Design a binder for this molecule. Sequence first.
Ligand SMILES: [Ca+2]
Lengths: 132, 132, 132
Amino acid sequence: LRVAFSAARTANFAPGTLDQPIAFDLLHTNLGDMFDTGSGRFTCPATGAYVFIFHILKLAISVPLYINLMRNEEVMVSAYANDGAPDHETASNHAVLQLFQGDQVWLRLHRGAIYGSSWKYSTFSGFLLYQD
Amino acid sequence: LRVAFSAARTANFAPGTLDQPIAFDLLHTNLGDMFDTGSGRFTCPATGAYVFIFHILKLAISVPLYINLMRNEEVMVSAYANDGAPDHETASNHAVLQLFQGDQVWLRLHRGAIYGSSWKYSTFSGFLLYQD
Amino acid sequence: LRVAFSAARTANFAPGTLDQPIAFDLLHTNLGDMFDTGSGRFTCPATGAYVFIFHILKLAISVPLYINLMRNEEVMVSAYANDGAPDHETASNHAVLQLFQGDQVWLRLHRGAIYGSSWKYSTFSGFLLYQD
Ligand SMILES: [Ca+2]
């Protein structure tokens, strides 16, 4: 199988409620058709090891940015960014995860707000490394 | 094909004109010989999906750092970093891109200035994920 | 061979001596059994090209964070993070390295202190790209 996605958000996300999934409207690639832009979820099509990377730019507001990489309902890794000016700042992390078919991987906006524009600062990608 | 590069800049880049390509003088790997240090460009040797990652440390000056990952003449993803002290800060992003043979991928210094030293803070890498 | 690890630190690291290796207590994956949590070292099981990524969150103290990605006793790439508030900040980088069997890759805390918690902000991963 060839499975890879690379997504970006081109409009801000500032929902007004904590702990929301982050949709990504734009895709550069979606090999395998397993990323869903509206929900922001990647669905595992085949048990195996997958690599994920994300970079999220915060709005220049005095609220810190907290991002979680979720697998189903579990926090796998997290990222923090804040600047007191307040200026933009970037919350980023990565993971290599063992997934089972049907598992979903997604980013949660725990706190803060996300910058989106056509220059695609805020991104989320993943790819299949080893298929079972 | 085996295609992968991992480059670093070991001297500062502060050109004095906006929107300049970023050369990377040092290579840890250049499997496939497709990265050119002088131009900072990766040339696609075979249509396929490629992964790119970059981390760029800014000079501690009161000019923000804006980096674009370019494919040919198009902005694919971007990164921002700034600190008001001013301190060093890091502009980073990644992408998984569908490339065609002959396409070129490179980093553009939109604004700001880059820190280079022998400890290799400022880096740019890529590798072939799926060959067509 | 299938070789990949993805580690996180869930407790702080503030050793009180500069230039210390960083242990990572938690693993999401350790395909090939080549990451050692206590030493923080990945041992190369087979000559080839390997990808490494790390994201390290600093303690909110007025000491900057400097991280080196080491191969044996050599600095390969480095990362810096600091914020004057002082706030948390993230030191991150990546590399694609040609390794020989027996080589060890690890992260060095040059200066600063690392934040660890159950939300897994501070991470280190690697995987085999091309086996010789
Ligand atoms: Ca930062």
